[PDB]
Amino acid sequence: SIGNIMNNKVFYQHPNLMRALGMHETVMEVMVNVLGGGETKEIRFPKMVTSCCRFLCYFCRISRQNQRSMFDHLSYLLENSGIGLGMQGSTPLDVAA
Amino acid sequence: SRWDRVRIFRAEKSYTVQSGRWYFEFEAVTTGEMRVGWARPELRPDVELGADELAYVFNGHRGQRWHLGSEPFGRPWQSGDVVGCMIDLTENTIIFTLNGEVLMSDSGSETAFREIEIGDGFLPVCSLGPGQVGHLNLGQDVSSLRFFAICGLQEGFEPFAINMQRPVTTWFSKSLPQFEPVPPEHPHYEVARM
């Protein structure tokens, strides 16, 4: 689903529409639920986590308004970035950066 | 020899001027290698005038001005020509005139040198080459000057010795070798006391 969205021209032509749909909030909530479970001993479904994180990184680079929207969850991303070191690739810390 | 070629004449260091506008004349009896201008009190006797930063002189043999090198300026003089050296320490400029006509460079520059720092001050100076005769007039008698009224009087310049009883004492570079202590800062020679 993330790959299809990032393959769609509308996702890049209308960043405001994506922001209105709350797409970044929905992806973030899915990611933290996986990170919330097993937050210290083991992170499972690593491919999903790095797919959501990579999606959010490209989401920020589309426009400054998208980047500002993700900036409002900077503290939310940081508190989930303590165990993100275990996963390699795109991490919640990378999204915050 | 290399040293018995140029004889440098300058006023005594007690006449150093650090302010005001001053004027003096130099008559070229001959037409050979002679330089005239203004020099700092620390002028070195064995160095050609204008070859370093201690003198601002005009070479009338071929029309050059000398300060840290040579560059064309003015025209060569003839026998009997009078060079009027003028320094303006309020505008930091030096003006040379030839028979009352201000000399100019290869441009509209009416001044030979500009933005000269006062520092220690300046002294009238002249150098004569082999077989050269020149007359230096520092203006103790204002009537003796031949072109001061034509160019220099109305500009606010004064003769270098306008109000002086005795003639200005002059020092010359004597080409008699003498033994002197080796300078502690000599560029090439160092003496170590063991």
Partner: protein, 149 residues
């Protein structure tokens, strides 16, 4: 950002170009897909350089090129075309007519459009500062070395 660098039309054109490379439609560009279009253009590269020209833009290192990476490549290409030529457009803003000199009337025209207003006399003050030649016009060479008018 992509929105700053690219317009809606450019994004549509890039997507069509990406779909031209991706004949399968899976959303990724493989080496054979990249190699096929190169042969259509005449070049016959080897897989050694073919992989290198993929890794040079492949961000996640999966070995395939997707649309987000393809757009990021084109975004850089549009951005890096202009490096220091920004002064050329600034010169043309003051230079309405199109020649190589900035006139006082032209300087009046831009100053009229801007918020600050001049009393038709101080316009000569800054133009003579910028114009060193003294011809009353500031050329491109005088503008870049020092900008006041």
């Amino acid at each position: 950002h992509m929105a700053d660098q690219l317009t809606e039309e450019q994004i549509a054109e890039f997507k069509e170009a990406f779909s031209l490379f991706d004949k399968d439609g899976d959303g990724t560009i493989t080496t054979k897909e990249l190699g096929t279009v190169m042969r259509s253009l005449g070049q016959n590269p080897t897989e050694a350089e073919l992989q290198d020209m993929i890794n040079e833009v492949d961000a996640d290192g999966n070995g395939t090129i997707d649309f987000p990476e393809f757009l990021t490549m084109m975004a850089r290409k549009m951005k890096d075309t202009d490096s220091e030529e920004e002064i050329r457009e600034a010169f043309r803003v003051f230079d309405k007519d199109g020649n190589g000199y900035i006139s006082a009337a032209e300087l009046r025209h831009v100053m009229t459009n801007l918020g600050e207003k001049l009393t038709d006399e101080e316009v000569d003050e800054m133009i003579r500062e910028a114009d060193i030649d003294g011809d009353g016009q500031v050329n491109y060479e005088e503008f870049v070395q020092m900008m006041t008018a």
